[PDB]
């Protein structure tokens, strides 16, 4: 799992969340992660589809 990666300096996780909407009440929104070590590397899924 990506959770067991090398943390960045300061007990910081190496992957940061990204969301599709600013409100937690929209019912069909995407989710994903962005890489801190390699800026520009993104993974993300919406519903049944996903991509890196």
């Amino acid at each position: 799992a990506l959770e067991e990666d090398a943390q960045l300096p300061g007990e910081q996780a190496a992957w940061t969340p990204i969301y599709s909407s600013a409100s937690e009440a929209v019912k069909t929104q995407a989710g994903g992660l962005r890489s801190l070590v390699w800026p520009g590397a993104v993974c993300g899924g919406r519903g049944s589809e996903w991509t890196c």
Binding site: A22, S23, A25, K27, T28, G47
Partner: protein
């Protein structure tokens, strides 16, 4: 050409734009002016909808 920033016959269009922009994000907590306490937000209605965004896709 020399016109104002926005005509005076535009309050309806401005109200429309404010209503449309209020759709996005969460509503800001408003407070009671005389009291100073925040106004209790409305409890949301329970409903079922489709995925309008996927249909747009």
């Amino acid at each position: 050409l020399s016109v104002p920033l926005v005509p005076a016959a535009s309050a309806a269009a401005a109200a429309a734009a404010v209503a449309k922009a209020s759709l996005f994000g969460d509503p800001e907590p408003v407070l009671d002016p005389e009291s100073g306490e925040p106004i209790d937000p409305d409890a949301p209605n329970e409903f079922e909808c489709e995925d309008v965004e996927g249909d747009g896709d």
